[PDB]
Symmetry: C3
Subunit: 95 residues, 3 copies
């Protein structure tokens, strides 16, 4: 599994959220952040199976891109395990 | 060492914070976030020794669980090093 | 590449931001957080080449330190890839 941390322009949040739901993303965590003068940005985090990382990255790039400076970045970070708090399920069962 | 990133329901913050302090957690970073309509959630991050990860995960699951949808998730992420800003101590000495 | 996550005292943000720009950091993501009673802190995230991690860590420690309790911590987390949303560039080209 991998954590995908994407920092995007605020006005792109609805579009990116909808696109991710479209490709099957079950849950996401969003945080208001600032970056670059510090400009407001939005962080989106999802944790997905290894085989689904590329489709997610492609979807975010295509939906969040404007071609202008400050579009943001995406980091792929390893995750050794995920646990669903409601049930105690782990791994594939927790995503 | 491992980073433990837990996303929980807001009203569970005091209970989870107290439980973690109870099991010996020395420090934690909390962020107001949103997730799933975006509902308010709270992110808690702690970095602990490998041998202490399971006890922390169990404590968070037991204290943050309600059995209802949206209880959240916990991600275990590898950390290659930790540095204490005040002293420059690293590793076990920085936790 | 590595993600560097630093949690510092709020009043140190301008100084740390300037120092990082001074040593060549191209972009950073800042989040208002709380930690330890929860006191306000600021999280700074940068992703850099492996050979630049130590210089960044040293710069943050030197600029953010006060010698007093609560100065914060720095976590070094592996990053398997970085993607620049504007162009689709990855790796060294995306930093
Ligand atoms: Cl992370």
């Amino acid at each position: 599994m991998k954590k995908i941390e994407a920092i995007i322009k605020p006005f792109k949040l609805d579009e990116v959220k909808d696109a991710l739901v479209e490709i099957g993303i079950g849950g996401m965590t969003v945080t208001e952040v600032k970056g670059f003068d510090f400009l407001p940005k939005v962080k989106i985090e999802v944790v997905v199976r290894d085989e689904d990382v590329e489709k997610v990255v492609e979807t975010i790039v295509k939906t969040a891109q404007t071609g202008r400076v400050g579009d943001g970045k995406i980091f792929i970070i390893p995750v050794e395990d995920v646990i669903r708090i409601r049930t105690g399920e782990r791994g594939e069962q927790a995503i």
